[PDB]
Nucleic acid binder design. Structure first.
Ligand SMILES: [Cl-]
Ligand SMILES: [Cl-]
Ligand SMILES: [Cl-]
Ligand SMILES: [Cl-]
Ligand SMILES: [Mn+2]
Ligand SMILES: [Mn+2]
Ligand SMILES: [Mn+2]
Ligand SMILES: [Mn+2]
Ligand SMILES: [Mn+2]
Ligand SMILES: [Mn+2]
Ligand SMILES: [Mn+2]
Ligand SMILES: [Mn+2]
Ligand SMILES: [Mn+2]
Ligand SMILES: [Mn+2]
Ligand SMILES: [Mn+2]
Ligand SMILES: [Mn+2]
Ligand SMILES: [Mn+2]
Ligand SMILES: [Mn+2]
Ligand SMILES: [Mn+2]
Ligand SMILES: [Mn+2]
Ligand SMILES: [Mn+2]
Ligand SMILES: [Mn+2]
Ligand SMILES: [Mn+2]
Lengths: 103, 96, 86, 95, 96, 78, 105, 92
DNA sequence: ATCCATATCCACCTGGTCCTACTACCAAAAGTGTATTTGGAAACTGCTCCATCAAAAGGCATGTTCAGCTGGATTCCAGCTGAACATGCCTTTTGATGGAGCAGTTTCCAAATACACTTTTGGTAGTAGGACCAGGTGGATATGGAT
DNA sequence: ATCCATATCCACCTGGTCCTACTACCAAAAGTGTATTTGGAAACTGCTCCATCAAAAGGCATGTTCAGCTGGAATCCAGCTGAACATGCCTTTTGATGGAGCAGTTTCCAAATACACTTTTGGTAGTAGGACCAGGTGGATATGGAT
């Protein structure tokens, strides 16, 4: 029996614990910290994968490519802020022509 | 000759993928981007929690430090939803 | 093991390529000097990044610049990149 | 001959803003990277994905910079980006 | 009279560029931060140096923002800053 | 209390910035910008205050909040 | 016997830098050389800053360095301004600089 | 008790400007500057050790970190002072 | 070129804010000496992938011509904003002072670490085999623009 | 409104590419149980400094009036840049090879840690003593601009 399923999570609690102590963030790491952090990570990936899946469906696709992630995060105010200093390789940009340049 | 076992987050984000869109795939490059995103958010949260502990003369990263770190880093609704998922998973884990 | 001398390769960044990049940025009309300016800009951008990259390389006592060196350089520059590692 | 000056440019905007492919030629960019890197340290080889990473980073940077530049030109009641625009953008960015 | 419009202005530019004192009155600022903070947690107190630090940071940020704003106005070949200049600045700085 | 910033105060800040003429619609704009600034930094500050289980916002809380905003401040510790 | 600072010929503390590296969780271990190198770099940087700031203090006919002198020192040196490009010195003010656009005539 | 870099900042100040004092707030800014650069170099070195799967922070990691952080002339002068200090330290 | 009205600056002075200095006290820090542990440098080498070569095809860069509309120069004036002033309201100041609460100290146990033994798992690997994405051709339909 | 010329687009296919899917091996996580260690929660509380209420004094905010000059609207045209087009080069693509140099493994030893015992130090708090500068004061002189 794993702690992930005990925490009701798909993301790995054990790996998050070890990786947590392998970076030296503090002398000690309580047992709730990796559960909480793995839960937050799983939630964020769920969110981005959801919006990106909508993106792939919008452009009648069957699998998510980096462009779909780009449209997903750039069209969500909050994800766009969280990844405001991030560059998604092969993501492209959003369609946006400043109005004064239009006919 | 016993190649370096490179660990990813790929199989987990794949599980989460089929839970939310059971018919959609993900390309290898988009997966690599997802792993980069997870390791990134991990480093930012764990870094903030570390700074909190040091700021309060503490040597333990509790789930509390993770929580207020999440509140510091994530914007608006994301923070509140993430905090709620963190509290649920912790209570369930300490429930068994 | 003789290699040719690399020089003036900034002009390989053609005026067409700079036009394309401007178009993706939504630019409609481009003055004739922009191109040289662009290259200048581009040059410094690369220089900085590449410095840090090879620094990481030199610290690892390696001779090949890895994608991870570029990713660490970019992350330090405050321009985090997803899709090549990390 | 048919379309008036400008509309083909809007077509090219919609086009390159719809896609993701890199827009600088691959081998000229690789040669530029090796020239610049050759001035920092001799005998430096590159993983191909390192040159690809540098190209993705470079084109993203330049595209964002062109967006800010366009904003500056429009702020000056013009539709033509000029070096003064790029310089104002990089200056306000703190570059 | 005695002076044409905009030379006492430059006189003030030199006056306040020479000096370091804070330019917003301290109590109205302290009231402002007390109000703004009252909406995150109630019954809060501030160390004097905390309010002072907030004022230093606020006036520094605003002065730099007025530099970039002035640059934006001059770029449109005007000498009077306008809200479009502040907004163009904050947009290029990434604050939008 | 956002109206506390008396238009001469804005004007002085702008003079230190190096401006000569100021539009009549600059003052409320500056009011808004200062408001969102103080909201962000103060929010982070009192988050640090809450994590310490205190009721007084210290100078150090403001220093940490500013530091994570990317606006590091010398002169008050840290 | 002698402080490790004297062994490296340094005014800055070697033992303290070693302890703060020890407790920063920057790594499991730190070699004996790293703290003296870090102390050396720190002492050098403070020496440069205090030098330029001292110059700025004498220029305004002043005996003691106040924050404005530090701000002038940092903002007038391209290198240190770059190093402190995202740092605000309290009570430091700005460099006297009027844009050459709204000048006389 | 509260630790500061103040007395060493003053030692270097008298070493470089013997007749020059320093106000208290300026000293506090100096201590914040030292703590800041300390955390930047130490963090850069920590990441450097992590990227290469190493457990120790040598003076070498500090050096590469300094080359990453300091601009140009500051970087070479500071590298110079540092390696000078380590060599003079190990000779005794 | 003349002159008036301020604004500016240099010299000297004086009270108090602010430094340094010097004493003592001392917990914490830093050094020393002794013993055990281990990270990672050296040496060897298996083998991934990087550099370089050739060859050939056409995608796209280059160089030119031509003219459309854009930027930048000029002129004008409506009204916006800066200058100056009288009034008088607040901010500042500083003073005393309860007492909230930050922070120092101590007790002590829930929780974290250490270690050893047992399963479970996640990569890496190869091989099979399908979905699906890219791109080529063709043939409606729209749409920018000349009429 | 008419209609030409060209771009856009939708519907399919089909070649090869790139993803999921099987079995299997398996060091290295990851779990588990035991025993041992301790960080910091709780509880008490002594001292700091934060909030508040008072009381003047004038610095500076507010509101107004009134005029200069700046922004913005309109008009004009040289010429800069976009669109199109012909030419051909040099990038892209495929494929192969030699070997640099990355990265895996073993040996070992220099350097790091662990721990106790000793010596030094920074730093905290009072308490003396002095210079440095902030803010006037005065009167010389430069400055902006209206004659
Ligand atoms: Cl915990
Ligand atoms: Cl220009
Ligand atoms: Cl506006
Ligand atoms: Cl070392
Ligand atoms: Mn239950
Ligand atoms: Mn060269
Ligand atoms: Mn006196
Ligand atoms: Mn070993
Ligand atoms: Mn026009
Ligand atoms: Mn008029
Ligand atoms: Mn109480
Ligand atoms: Mn498995
Ligand atoms: Mn498809
Ligand atoms: Mn297609
Ligand atoms: Mn097929
Ligand atoms: Mn304890
Ligand atoms: Mn004008
Ligand atoms: Mn013409
Ligand atoms: Mn070899
Ligand atoms: Mn002492
Ligand atoms: Mn004075
Ligand atoms: Mn006088
Ligand atoms: Mn005159």
């Amino acid at each position: 029996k794993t702690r992930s399923s005990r925490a009701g999570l798909q993301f790995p609690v054990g790996r998050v614990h070890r990786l947590l102590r392998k970076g030296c963030y503090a002398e000690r790491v309580g047992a709730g910290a990796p559960v909480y952090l793995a839960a937050v990570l799983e939630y964020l990936t769920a969110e981005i994968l959801e919006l990106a899946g909508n993106a792939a469906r919008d452009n009648k696709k069957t699998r998510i490519i980096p462009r779909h992630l780009q449209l997903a995060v750039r069209n969500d105010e909050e994800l766009n802020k969280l990844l405001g200093r991030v560059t998604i390789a092969q993501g492209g940009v959003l369609p946006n022509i400043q109005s004064v340049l239009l006919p | 000759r016993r190649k370096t076992r490179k660990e990813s987050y790929a199989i987990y984000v794949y599980k989460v993928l089929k839970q939310v869109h059971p018919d959609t795939g993900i390309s290898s490059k988009a997966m690599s981007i997802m792993n980069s995103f997870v390791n990134d958010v991990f480093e930012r949260i764990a870094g903030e929690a570390s700074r909190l502990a040091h700021y309060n003369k503490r040597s333990t990263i509790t789930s509390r430090e993770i929580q207020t770190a999440v509140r510091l880093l994530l914007p608006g609704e994301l923070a509140k939803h993430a905090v709620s998922e963190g509290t649920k998973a912790v209570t369930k884990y300490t429930s068994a | 093991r003789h290699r040719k001398v690399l020089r003036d390769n900034i002009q390989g960044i053609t005026k067409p390529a700079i036009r394309r990049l401007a178009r993706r940025g939504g630019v409609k009309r481009i003055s004739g000097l922009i191109y040289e300016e662009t290259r200048g800009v581009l040059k410094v951008f690369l220089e900085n990044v590449i410095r840090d990259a090879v620094t990481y390389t030199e610290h690892a006592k390696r001779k090949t610049v890895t994608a991870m060196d570029v990713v660490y350089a970019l992350k330090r520059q405050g321009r985090t990149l997803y899709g090549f590692g990390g | 001959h048919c379309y008036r000056p400008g509309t083909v440019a809007l077509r090219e905007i919609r086009r390159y803003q719809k896609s993701t492919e890199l827009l600088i030629r691959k081998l000229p960019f690789q040669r530029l990277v090796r020239e610049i890197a050759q001035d920092f340290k001799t005998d430096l080889r590159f993983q191909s994905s390192a040159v690809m990473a540098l190209q993705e980073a470079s084109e993203a940077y330049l595209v964002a910079l062109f967006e800010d530049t366009n904003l500056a030109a429009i702020h000056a009641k013009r539709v033509t980006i000029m070096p003064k625009d790029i310089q104002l953008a990089r200056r306000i960015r703190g570059e």
